Design an enzyme around this catalytic site. Sequence first.
Site, PDB file in Angstrom:
ATOM      1  N   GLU B 357       8.098  39.000  -5.410  1.00 40.31           N
ATOM      2  CA  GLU B 357       8.477  39.418  -4.064  1.00 40.31           C
ATOM      3  C   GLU B 357       8.911  40.879  -4.040  1.00 40.31           C
ATOM      4  O   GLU B 357       8.689  41.583  -3.048  1.00 40.31           O
ATOM      5  CB  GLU B 357       9.586  38.516  -3.524  1.00 40.31           C
ATOM      6  N   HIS B 487      -5.577  25.266   2.380  1.00 41.40           N
ATOM      7  CA  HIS B 487      -6.392  26.439   2.680  1.00 41.40           C
ATOM      8  C   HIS B 487      -7.681  26.083   3.405  1.00 41.40           C
ATOM      9  O   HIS B 487      -8.203  26.912   4.160  1.00 41.40           O
ATOM     10  CB  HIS B 487      -6.709  27.195   1.388  1.00 41.40           C
TER      11      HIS B 487
END
Lengths: 248, 597
Positions: B357, B487
Site C-alpha cells: 500500500e 473478476h
Amino acid sequence: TRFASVYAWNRTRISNCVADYSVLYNFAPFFAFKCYGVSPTKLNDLCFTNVYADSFVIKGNEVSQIAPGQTGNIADYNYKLPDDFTGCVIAWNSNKLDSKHSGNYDYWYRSFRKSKLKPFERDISTEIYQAGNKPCKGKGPNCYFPLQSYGFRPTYGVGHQPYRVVVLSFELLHAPATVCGPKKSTNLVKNKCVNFNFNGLTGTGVLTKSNKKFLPFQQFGRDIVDTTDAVRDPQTLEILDITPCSFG
Amino acid sequence: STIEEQAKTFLDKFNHEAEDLFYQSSLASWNYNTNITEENVQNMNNAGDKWSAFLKEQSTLAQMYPLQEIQNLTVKLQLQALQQNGSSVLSEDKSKRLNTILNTMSTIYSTGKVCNPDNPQECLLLEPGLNEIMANSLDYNERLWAWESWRSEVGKQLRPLYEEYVVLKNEMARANHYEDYGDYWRGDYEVNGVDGYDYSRGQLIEDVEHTFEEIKPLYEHLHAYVRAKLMNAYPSYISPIGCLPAHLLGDMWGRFWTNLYSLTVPFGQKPNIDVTDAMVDQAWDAQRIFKEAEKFFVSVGLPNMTQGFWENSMLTDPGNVQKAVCHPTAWDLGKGDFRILMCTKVTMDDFLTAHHEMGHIQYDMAYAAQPFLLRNGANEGFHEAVGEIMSLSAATPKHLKSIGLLSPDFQEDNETEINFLLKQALTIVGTLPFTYMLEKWRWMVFKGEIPKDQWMKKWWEMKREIVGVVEPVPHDETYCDPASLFHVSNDYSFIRYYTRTLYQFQFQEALCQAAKHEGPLHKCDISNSTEAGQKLFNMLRLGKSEPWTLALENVVGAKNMNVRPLLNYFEPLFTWLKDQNKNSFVGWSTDWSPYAD
C-alpha cells in the site's frame, strides 16, 4: 480579520510614524519573509517619505510567485512586483483561520485574461474570456469566466493551504520624509568628562546642573562667541550646562 | 486563436471542477468504508451520482476539439480521455438491461451459499466456509460434495444472464468500432503515434502466447512434482499420468496453489521463515510497521509521507463502535490528500501488505503532478507491480535481519531456499496458466469462436489442455461455472494479473542490476539503494502521459514483456525440479478423468 482577495488587493498608506517591525511577531511569529534591495537590519534606522502595505491571500504553492521576475497565475493576472522593487515580502500560513468545512469559496483569483497585468496594477473586471474566433455572447461553448474560486478545505495539503501575504513598499520623494526607523537613547551621567549626543548635537565636556531659565520653545543656548554652553534633556526637560574638560 | 488553445482553455476549466468532485467522491467513499451508516451510504451515493453526471456533461462537449488538429500530446490524451462514449452509445433499454444483469450477477455472487443436505437449515457461505474446506480439509468426499454443490447452486442460475451480458458487451464493442469486448479490453494495451513504441492488440496475444509457451516447461515440471506429492498425499485419488482434480487444487476455482505447500513441502524438517513471533516479542504494532516501511522507502530514495497521511489513515481496528471495511485499500483523494485503510495486525503478511500500500501511495504521489486525467499508471498492473517489488524486497531475509527482526545467528541453507522458491512458485507460477486459460476462454466467448452449445465443453477442454485440471463431473451447458468468480461476474479482466506478474519480476531484476547486486536474485535487497529508487521514481512520476512501452524500457530496457526474469529467479528451483522429476513422468494426459471408471 478579513483580508482582501488577491485579484482585488487593497493598498494601505502609512505615514507620519515610526516603522516598528517587532509587533508583527505578536500576531503570529511564523512570518516567513524575504527582502529585495534592502535588509531588515539596516532598515531599523532608514527614513522614507511614504510607506504602502498590500494584503492578499493565496495558496501555499503560489507564495513563491510573489517575487520580482516570477511568472504564474498570480504573478501575471492577480499581483506582480516590479523588477527593481525595494522592500520585503512577508507571508504566513492561515489554514486554521481562512479554511472552512465543505470548501471556503469566499476567495477568488483571476486565471484568464487577454493580457497580463503590470506591476502594482489592480483589475476587477469580470468580462467573459472569449477563447474562440467567433464573437462571444452569453455563456456556453468557448466561453470562460475570468475568476475562479479557491475552495479552501482544512484537510488539504500544505501546498493548497491558504497563505496570507503582506508586501511592504517604500517611496522617497523631494518632500520632507515623515517615516523613519526606531532609535536608541541611554542614561545620563554627571560630573564626568564624557561624550554626549543630544538629538543630533555632538560634543564633549562635563555636564552639571545650571540655573538658566529657558523659554518653552528654547532648546539650546549660546554665548557671545556663539559656542554651545547649555542644552536640555529631551526626556527630562531640565537645564544642563556644558563645560570643557581640563587641559593645559 | 486555434483549436489547440481552445482545448487547453477547456482543460484548464475542467481540471479544477474535476479534482474538486473527485476529492468529494473520495471523501464520501472513505467515510462510507470507515463508518457504515445510512448518512455515509447516502453521501456516497450522492457523490457517485454527481460524478456520473459530471462525466456525462463533460462528454459530448470535448468532441468539438478534433484530435486531427491537436499537436500537444498531453492535450490530445486528455481530449481522448474526455471523448469516450462508453456504454451510452447504445439505447437506454439495452444499457438498463446490461446494468440490471450486472447487478443481479453481483448479488448472486455475493449471496452464494451452500447448504448441508442432511440439514437444510444449516448453510455455509463461499468465503467463510467453502474456501476453508478447500484450504484445510483432506476428505475427498466433502471436497467433491462442496465443489459440486457450489456450482450446481450458483452456475445454473447465471448461464442466460451471462449469455445476454456477453451479447450486450459485443454489441457495445461493435458500436465503438471494436471486434468484440475482449478486443475492447486489449485496446488499452494499444499504442499509436509514437515512433518505435507502437503496439497492436494482436501483438499482445502473440506475446502472451509466447510467454505461456516459455513457462510451459517449468509449469509442467511443477505440475509433475505436485502430482507426485499428491499421489502420497491422496492415495488412489491422483493418477500417475492423469490431470489433477479441480477440488484438490487448494481452493474452489484452483487459482492459487499456496494451500498445497503443507502437502508438497520438500524438506519439512526445516523451520519456516516467519518474523511474526519476533515482531510480537518486540511489541510491534501497525504504527511501527508503517514507520519501518517509511524508513525503507526513504532509504531507497522515495519521498516521505505527509502529516495528513498519518492523521487521516485508519491504520487500526476501529472496533464494533464504528463498522469499517478492514480490506487493505489504497486511496488517492487529490490536493495532497493520501490515505490508507487497513486494519494492520502484528504479522508478516500485514507487514508486506503495508509496503504494498505504501508503494501504491508513492505511485499516487508521483503521478499527482500530472493532470487529473493523467493521474493514473501506464497500465493496470503497474501499481501492483511497484507494490509487489517493495513487498518482496522487504520479505528478503537480509532486510528482515538488518531491521532487527531475524536473529544475527541466522544461517541459510539450500533446503530453505528451495522450499521458499517452491512456495513462491505455487503462489505465483501456479496461477499463470489458469489466468491465461481463463482470459483466452473469455476472449473466445466474446469474439464468438466457441458456439453457445459448447461453452462448458470448450472450457473443460482448455482447462485440461493448459492448466492440467480435469473436472470430476462433466457439467453440461446449463452450468456457468466460469461466471462463479469475482473478476468474471463483476466485469474485470484477468490479463492484468499476468502482466503484473511479468512486470514485477522485470522491475525487480532492473532494480537489482541498478543496485549492483551479486549472487542469487532472491537474495537481492534494494535497501539503502537510492539509485534504484530514484530510477523507479523517474518513471512513476510520468503516470499515463507516456506509453507503457517507453515506461517499461526506461526501467528494464525492454519495450515488451519478458519471461527471462522469472526464469532467472526460479533457475535453482528449475534445476531442483529437473533433478527430482527424473523418476516421474513430465506433463499430463487429457484422456484420464475421475469419472472414467
